Amino acid sequence: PRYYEYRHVVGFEETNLVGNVYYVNYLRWQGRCREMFLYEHAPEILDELRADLKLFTLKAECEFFAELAPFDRLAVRMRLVELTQTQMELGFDYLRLGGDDLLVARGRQRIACMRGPNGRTEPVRVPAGLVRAFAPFRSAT
């Protein structure tokens, strides 16, 4: 279990006039996937994130290979690519679950942990709890 899975049934609001899913939604799903991971494996991070901790997204990207239709069942699999003192690089595989599974997109995010008054924040070491939650996903043993 080296990845976290977020499942989603595509809705009409996510489509555009061409009939497929508008590209922005793929980036939105990265955030949804990453926060559900926190909800299920490190809920304590919200209290921090509701306090003074901040998760700053340094980079967000997605490459698209195929299209998605309304009501396609999607599985976004998140993996930990790299964990540094203060940052985390996350990888996302987007699978359309059907008669057969199809990789419709692949993305990445780099996030930095930070604390301090808005405008006067500084990078902080990845919270111990989050590092523990990442245990099964870390390449390092």
Ligand X SMILES: COCCO[C@@H](C)CO[C@@H](C)CO[C@H](C)CO[C@H](C)CO[C@@H](C)CO[C@@H](C)CO[C@H](C)CO[C@H](C)COC[C@@H](C)N
CB 44, CB 85: distance < 8 Å: no
Contact with ligand X (CB under 6 A) among 58, 69, 97, 135: 58
Residue 101 in the binding site for a copy of itself (CB under 8 A): no
Min dist. Cβ of residue 65 to ligand X (A): 6
Binding mask 106-125 for ligand X (x = CB under 6 A): ------x----------x--
Sequence-distant (6+) residues with CB within 8 A of 87 are 58, 110, 111, 112, 113, 123, 126
Closest residue to ligand X, based on beta-carbon distance: 112
Contact with a copy of itself (CB under 8 A) among 11, 84, 101, 132: 11
Q: What is the DSSP letter of 20?
A: S
The footprint of a copy of itself on residues 32-61 (CB under 8 A) is: 32, 35-36, 39, 43, 46, 49-50, 54, 56-61
User: Which of the choices a copy of itself, ligand X, none does residue 3 contact, using the CB cut-off of 5 to 8 A by kind?
Assistant: none
Q: SS3 sequence, 69-130?
A: CCCCEEEEEEEEEEECCCEEEEEEEEEEECCCCEEEEEEEEEEEEEECCCCCCEECCCCHHH
Residues engaged in binding ligand X (CB under 6 A)? 56, 58, 65-67, 112, 123
